[PDB]
Structure formats: structure tokens, C-alpha cells
Symmetry: D2
Subunit: 334 residues, 4 copies
């Protein structure tokens, strides 16, 4: 009884969500909407990927439909989201991934198209936010349109939840060394809003401001007003690492932190929070489905009330898998 | 008696043309037009450069004008090129560098604005093409709108002229390993027209097609229909190298080729064609004003009628200096 | 009846040969010799790879032996190759991959250790050279020590053989845009022999001289003295492309060249020479086992007697697979 | 009355120290010792630089001596430091920059060669440590052999001194995003001691451990046992940024921190500690002689007792200038 899923927008997040859905098999993709991309271009884009390699399967175009592993997918090219006939294709859930419809009113334009529930793959100002393994038990069948927050937030939230539940975080500051994204540009370029983001991505570091640590307090209400930070954008393909410096109420040696993190990674947070002790680097976490992997050897502790923790997280993947897992849990709650 | 120069578009070519004009002092910039960039953003963009470093001088904004080294520059923000009041600012020549007005009819929209002559910093379908040091003596004061072809063409043309004048090129194929440009994109991305150009610039090589070697036959009429080739786009900041494989009529040892190239580089083509024998790499030619520099040690010769020549050329700079030199020669012919 | 294979040196070529042998299953690895690497370091090096990703299997160390997929491997740490007890481990063939024993006299030091035949994974001055699919039928059971030439040579030889057999290459010049290797260095550095190779690999192009096209005439005797060229070293992880500019005796349109290349790629040279018509880039050929893949859209033809051909080849892989295939053919001839 | 300076080792630090000494003109270089580099190779290495560009001056070799700007320099090629005739060349101070003679006993081998005082351009276990602008007034003419600590330490120490003097740092954790160095290697490689450092520098982030924040407590005795941290090695040419997260005794808004940092940067710490408010990136600090530049817009403050500060520092340069400034102050104290 897999739910029917339509995808709005065939960008990096939409293609990776489709790839993760076909690899895991938890949900079924029946419809893809993109107005600027024709069918053969979507075949070429889904077939070849520079970062994650070639697709393991058969993808082609026939009868005006995108056939992936023998499964036909109806293609729409409507710019206005209110005109898309989601109910004609039979799609029950709709993943909004264009990044321009983030408010509840804008994302509610899929409702008159025949869609039941809309999941936004972006942070939202007013839609409820859910992170798998942290607060996903708060979801109700009354929540038609929700949000999966952001990848960084998805990296920070389970580790922060475990550390706050075991030792009581007083306050913390987070720094995330981030890989390059589609919004950056080569050889400098223009960028009215953010002047730093318009510089050349290949030759620079480029500090930036983010609100993921502030969104952690939205996801976990006890940590509201205790977490904030910034980011660096280094020229890496698809690996980012989160660094969290925090102060704790109860004394905690580094071995106790490692023990409780490994214990949480084994049972309750299996598949979400990872644990390792090897001498790993960034490219060892390519195409990893974990939301975050705790690095035991990388972190350092100044004292029992002042520590610093390091976590690896894949930007492209992982989140897509959390979107698929959230849709599966939503279908299970139906 | 320096000529007054206005610049349309403040992109990479326009900023570098302004920088080269202020460094050399041959011409004077009195007007800059760009509709999407405000004045403080142009101050920030001209002040800081990721590739060529900080500007050697004083740049600021005062009284709604851009003051560079004590020289005020009037700023226009007109999208339609026919509405720009070039004659009000006193600009005599206009450098069209936006890359969207390449035909004679489109570039003639600056004529009713009060401009006398328009120089296009791009290849053109119907405007006459001039390369400094090769065919710039063919220019007439009757030529209001002309073109400076392309940088690659500007790299290939003097070396090909010298080799054809000394040994009689029968036919040749050219390959140019090119640095990244503003049209490429990080982390793959979309590109309807050219599907290869939409892939990730950081992780790929990306073969491409170019018409610079075909434009050499337009500049040099005796070589028409004898030169064609392609290109590779490697992730380099701003250095490209041209490789030319050719067949000659008269026998020519490699020492004779080196001798005639050094002799041509010394006298007639001083400052345009360079010559070196050191063990150089690409970053040794950063901020070099030469159109092309012949690498003696890099090339190889199969036999006296079949050789391969290597030339280094800076993409960002050099061309801008050739635009400034062409404008100076145009003002001298007046 | 798989042959027993020992590997001398656990560098990039030795590890990739072991990986290809365990993936294909044609031969069996029973012994690895390296004096500078301890056992746990070899476990860590074989387990994690930055370019080709994690190993698909189980690798561990037990009883002083390297266990890969349940197969134990004896480990030697002898610096002098004459003291290695190859016959004690039961290894019949020995792959010499350290790159310092390339002559016949130096590579013959494995013979008194109990090894029967020695295969050098490097170009050799006096050992016979064999390329799979080109001249591998010339091998005799009298040839104990031979060579597999080089990867570039392995890329160039089948395409050149097909083009020479169909159209009669008169002469040709080859340029190969190469990825970075272990001999290069970051942030410049020292390099007495080659001054260009000591410069910084990340920021430069670095022309270099190679003898692969000269070695093609050693492999194919009819093309002796007709092929020579050079190379460029761009900062790419593991993808290189070969560009060959050639003159032909019989007239040949580009469609006929594409037809004969596709026909040769289908039947006789299946798995060695590849053919494609898609808009591919370098990272599309990551972990590809083909020796060379002909790019139909990338090449250009000046005329029926003057053409330019483009081929993609993986530096790390492919060659390792050709070493494994050559050892399998050698065992079949026994 | 400039002091005579000899340099041991012509690596990256020695060449940059010579370049900074010839650019500033505070000291005079009379002798260079390197056993593995011949004279023409040093001419080529000093003439061309991939990061900082070509040398602004004349460098050549004549009469077995290195002539820079008309100044001859005697060249030694002695491996054993005790055999170098420093007193024959007239050198009074000796800069030890090979990185293998860091103890007092090993660096004292230059004393019987005729040298008076030895300055180590590396952290030392037992030699006294001096940072310019922080504790350089503690130096005595009784200190023949001393140390200039490390560049990171030189970046962190003035900012930490200002913040501790104004607001009383309780404890702090430091993270520094570092550019690539000569010890890293391309395409992975071997690294017995540190397994993470042997991975490929181009494709990875590579966490590492450093003792610069622990050395700050050695330089500033009041901060002993209050500062520790780690590092990340991203593939950048020559720009690194320091991030310091700290807790303060007295309340401090971000505007007060900016005011006291700007006031300290203007008067007492002119030329050592920099201040900026522009939207800068890493490549804007290329060839900057400041030890550290405070970034006002990049940092963030959680509350009045918990802040995070960002500072930019050039790895190659700056330190070399601090070595030259320390030698000038040492000569002034004589």
C-alpha cells in the first residue's frame, strides 16, 4: 500500500528524491512537473550525475512518459502550480521542491489540483517543521502541508537532542563547513542581495549566515533561544561537516559522550544518527544515507562542562532519504 | 588628445577594460552604463577582484558619480540602448560589452544616443573584425561600428600570421584548453541549448565547440577554409593555452621556427606576441598583457612538414588591453 | 584453474589491481609484498578510497594475514626483491608495480624467489610490450617477464589500430589532457629533474613530455616513427582524454569513421574499446573498465584526409583490468 | 645599520622570508644554505611563484653567487649544520627554517659556525617563544636562540590578547579552516604517522589536530590552560580563517567588541592586527602583511557572555614579515 507521490520541480532535490524513492522502494513516483525542462533533457539529467554517478537501472522516454524501471511517469509542464492536474495522475502526496513556494498560502496552491498533502523540502516561515527521529511523532493526519526543515538542521537536531537529553545543553554556537551549492557562481559574478555570495566559488571560502541552529529550537522547544551560528562555503563537491561548541550542566567526560552517542546510534536512532571511530575524511561519506555521523576522534573537550563535537553529513543525499522516510511515516499514520 | 570612451555593461569585460584603460592611460573613461547594478555595488566590484587582486588606486562614489583616481564618471541605468544619452556625457567611442548586441543593427542603437563609433568586444556576424598587429591597418575612419573578434582568435592570429608568412600553412587543427567562464555553473545545473555546458564546472573537463579558428580565416583571407577546431574547459581560474597542429609547404626545422618567432616577437609584434624559453606554467602568465606567448620547450615537431605549436594566453586580460590599443589606434587615425 | 598472483608494492596500481582481481574473480591474490606499510595500514588503505569509494566487501586482518572476502593473503615486508619467498606462498605470477624495477635484469630478481613469470605494470626499456586486444596474440609461454606498457598507450593503441587498418594513417600527433598523479605536488615544491613538475598541481596546467605515442609504434610495427606528442596535467581527480590529430591515405568521411569504430567496438574489441554518442563529460567515465571510449560528438574533421579524434580513458582503473585480463590470457595459454 | 641575516633551507618559508626582507629592506640577506638545490634551480624558484606571482626585481646567478637587485649572496650546500661557515659570509643572525632542527641543542649547531643568534621559524619544545606585538618586549640580548612560534599562533595571539585585556576570557575553543600545505599529498598516498593526512588533498576536508591555541597560553601566561582546538584542511591555495568561540567575564555587546578591536588595530597594533567591515572573502587577503584581520560582519554573538569571532590570516606571508620584524627589533635591542 505505497502512497502515490508527485514531485514539483526537477532540480537537484527533486531528482535526488526520485532516485532515493526508486532505490528504497518505500513510495511510488507517478508524476513529475517542470515547465523549463523537456522530456529528453530529464532523461539525460536523471541518467547521468557528476557526483553520485550513473543511475543503477533503466531510464527512457516513451509515449510522452518517463519510464523508469518499467514504471511510467506522467510529465507536466505547468508554470502556475494551481493549474497542475495532480488528481488526474492519481498522486496523493506532493513534494514541493522548487524553493519559491515556501509559505502555507503559496504551497496551498497544490490543494485544488487534487493533491491531499503537500510536503515542502525547504525551511518555511509558517508551516510546521518535522525532523525524522526527533519530533516526527508529533505529526497528525490533520497536517496536510508541512515542512522537513533543512539538511543542516537535519544533521544538527538528533545529535543535539541526544546531548541535551543526557547532559543538559546550556548554550551553544555552531559552525558548519559547507560544500558548494547551485546558488554560487564561478569566476565571481553578480549577487545584489548577498555581496559575498557573488564571488568566485572555486577560489574563495565565503562566510555566510544561516538559521539552522535557530530552527533547531523550533524543532526542539527546550532549546529555543540557545543556539545560533554561521557557515563557510569551501569548494567541495558534496560533503559538509558540522562543528558544535557547547556548555553542559552535568559533568561529562568525552568517553561518556562517546558511549551515550554510540548507544543512541545503535538502538533508537538506527539509520538516522551514525557513529564511527575510524580516521575518516569527507569523501568517505559520499552517498551515505545517514542524517549525521558522529566523529569520535575529530572532536575535542576543553573540560567536563565545555566540549566541541564534530559530525559529518551529506548535503545532496540523506535529506532526500529523510523526505522519503517522512512520507512513508505519513502514509503509515493514514 | 585622448578620446572619450563610454562602456556599456559592467560585467567582467567592462570592468577589466576600465581597469586596463586606467592602468595604461591611453584613453579616458567618462561614462558607464549598467541597469542591474547600483553605484555602491560597482564600487565594491571594481575595488575587489578574486583573480587579479585589489585595484591599485582610489575608487569611491560621490555626488552620484563614480570617482576613480580623482576622475568622475557619469553612471547610467538605461536598459534600452537607444535611450542612453552618450552625447550628454561627452563620450565619443562606446564599447559594447554586454554580449547581446552583436549584430550591426543592434549595435547601431548607440548611434542616436550621440556616440560616434561603437566597438564590439565580441565576435560579430556582420560587423568587420580587426585584430591588433594582424590586420589593424585595414581600418578606415568610415568604419563607425567594428569588432575585436575574440580572445582566442586574438591569441591564434599573430602566431598563425607569422608561421604562414614564413612557411606557408597548408592546413591546421587547433585545440585550446580553456579556463572556466561566467556561463558555466557549479554542481551541474540546467543548459537547454548546450547540454554539456550545464554540467558541473569543478569536477569535469567538458568538450566544447568554438569558431575562433574559422574566424582566423576571416581576419587573414589567405587562410580561409584551412583552420577549424574545438576546446576543453578545465577548472582553471584564468589561464588558457592554445595548441595548434599544422602542416607546412616549405621544410622547417624547430630551431628555424623558434628563430623566426623570436625575431617577430622582438621587432614588429612587440607587446602583442611574446616569446619565452623558461619552464613556465599557466599561473606564470597571470595578469600578462600579451595576446599570446610562444612556448619553445612545450611544442614538438614530428617532421619538417608536420609540427605542433603551443601558446599561452590570458583570457581575462590581454584582450582588454587589445581593446584599449585598438581604440587608441582608432583615435590616432582620426 | 585460476592462477596464483602475488603483488609487489601496495601503491595505487597494486591496490587497484587487487580490487579489480577480487571484483572480476579471474585470478586469485595470495601474496602482497610492501616493506613500508604495516598490516593495519593496508587494511585502512584497501578499505577506503577517495576516488572509487568504499570497497564492496569485507576486509580485515587476522593471524598476521590480510583476509579479504574470507580469503587469507600472506604479507611480506622485504625491501630486496631477491629475498621474497614467492614460492613459499604458492604464487605463480608476480605483478611488479613499484615502478623502480623496469629493466629485465631488475625484474628478474623475482625469479629465484620461486616465481615463474613476472608482469611489469610500467613501460620497460627492454622487456616485450603487450596491449590487450592489439598484439596480445603474439605472447609465448617462453615469455616469463613481459610488460603491459602504459595506460595512455592502452588508450591510444586500439583506436589507432582500427583507424590504421581501415584508412591507413600516414602520420599523427597526439595530445592527452591528463589528471593529477602521485608524482605531482601541492603548493609547488621541489623537482630537480623536471622543473615544471615541481610546481603546484592545484593552480596550474603544467605541460609535460610523454612517450606513449612512440610506444604505440613499438606495439604496432607498421606505425613506427609516425606518432609522437606531449601532455597537459590539469587538476582533475581521475579522468583523462586523448586527442589524436591524423592524416589518412584513403578518403574517409566522419560517418564512415563512426561506423567502423562502432562496428569494431561491438564485435572483436568488446570490453576494450568503447563507443558512445551521448553528451558525456569526464566524470561519466569514473570506474569504467574500458581501455578507451570513442566520443563521436566531440571530434571534428577538417577534410577527408585530415581528421581529429577524441577518446576518454580512466587512468586509475581500466589498466588494472587490462593487467588482470592479460594474466588470465597468460594462464589460458599455459 | 642593518643586521646580516643568513637563511638555512630554501623551502617555502625561506624563500618567502628572503622575498619579504628584500621588499621591506629592514634586514640584509648575505647567505643562503641548501644542500639539495643547485644555484640555477634557486634562481628559477625565487623568480617564479604560483601563488604570489613573479618577483618584482632582478634575480640572476653570476660568479657562483645569487645576485638579487645587485646584491650578491653566498651559497652553501652543507647538510650538517655544524659545518656551515656562517662567520665567513659575515652573517650575524641565522634563520633556521628547515623544520627539522627545532630543539635548542639541534639549533645550537649554528653557533660554532660563527653565527651569533639563531631564530627558529617553527614552534619549539624548549626554546623561548616570541610573538610580535604581544610579548616581544620580553626579549633580552641574552637570548641567542629563540622561536617565532607558528602562523596560526601569530594570528590568534593579538586578538586574544585584546579580548582578554578588555573583557576577561574565561575559556575558549578555536577552529581554524586551513589551506593546503607542502606536507599534504594529491591522489591520497601514504602517511604512517597521521593516517588522515595521507588522503587526497584535492577532494577532501581532512580534520587535524594542532597545538596553536595551547601555545597561546605559553605566549600569554594568564591564558594558560584555557584554550585548545583543532583544524580543517580545505583545498585552498593560501588563505586560512580562524574561528574562536569564547566566554567572557564582563558583559560585552558586539558593538563594544568592534570598537575596542578597531581602537587597538589603529594605534598600538598598527600593521599587526587588521580591522575591516567590508564583505570580504579569502582571496581579498592574498599577499597581506597583517598577522590577523578581524572580520566584523562574519562573527556572531549568542549573548553578552558568549561570542564567536572570525579572523582572516595569510599562511605563506605575514609570518615571514613577522620574522623580519622580530629580527629588526632584535637588531634594535643590540
Amino acid at each position: 500500500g505505497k502512497v502515490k507521490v508527485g514531485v514539483n520541480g526537477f532540480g537537484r532535490i527533486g531528482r535526488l528524491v526520485t532516485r532515493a524513492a526508486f532505490n528504497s522502494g518505500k513510495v511510488d513516483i507517478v508524476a513529475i512537473n517542470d515547465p523549463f525542462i523537456d522530456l529528453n533533457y530529464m532523461v539525460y539529467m536523471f541518467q547521468y550525475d557528476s557526483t553520485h554517478g550513473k543511475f543503477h537501472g533503466t531510464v527512457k522516454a516513451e509515449n510522452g512518459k518517463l519510464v523508469i524501471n518499467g514504471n511510467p511517469i506522467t510529465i507536466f509542464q505547468e508554470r502556475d502550480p494551481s493549474k497542475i492536474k495532480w488528481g488526474d495522475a492519481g498522486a496523493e502526496y506532493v513534494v514541493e521542491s522548487t524553493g519559491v513556494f515556501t509559505t502555507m498560502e503559496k504551497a496551498g496552491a497544490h490543494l485544488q489540483g487534487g493533491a491531499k498533502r503537500v510536503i515542502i523540502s525547504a525551511p518555511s516561515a509558517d508551516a510546521p517543521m518535522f525532523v525524522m527521529g526527533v519530533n516526527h511523532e508529533k505529526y497528525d493526519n490533520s497536517l496536510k502541508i508541512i515542512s522537513n526543515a533543512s539538511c543542516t538542521t537535519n544533521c544538527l537536531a538528533p545529535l543535539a537532542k541526544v546531548i541535551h537529553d543526557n547532559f543538559g545543553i546550556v548554550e551553544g554556537l555552531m559552525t558548519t563547513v559547507h560544500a558548494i551549492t547551485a546558488t554560487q557562481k564561478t569566476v565571481d559574478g553578480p549577487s545584489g542581495k548577498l555581496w559575498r555570495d557573488g564571488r568566485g566559488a572555486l577560489q574563495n571560502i565565503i562566510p555566510a549566515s544561516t538559521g539552522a541552529a535557530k530552527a533547531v529550537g523550533k524543532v526542539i522547544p527546550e532549546l529555543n533561544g540557545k543556539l545560533t551560528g554561521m557557515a563557510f562555503r569551501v569548494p567541495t563537491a558534496n560533503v559538509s561537516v558540522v562543528d558544535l561548541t557547547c556548555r553542559l550542566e552535568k559533568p561529562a567526560k568525552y568517553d561518556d559522550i562517546k558511549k551515550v552517542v554510540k548507544q543512541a546510534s545503535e538502538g533508537p536512532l538506527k539509520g538516522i544518527l551514525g557513529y564511527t571511530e575510524h580516521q575518516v575524511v569527507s569523501s568517505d561519506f559520499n552517498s551515505d544515507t545517514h542524517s549525521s555521523t558522529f566523529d569520535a576522534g575529530a572532536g575535542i573537550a576543553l573540560n567536563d562542562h565545555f566540549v566541541k563535537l564534530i559530525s559529518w553529513y551529506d548535503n545532496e543525499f540523506g535529506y532526500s532519504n529523510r523526505v522519503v522516510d517522512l512520507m512513508a511515516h505519513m502514509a503509515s499514520k493514514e
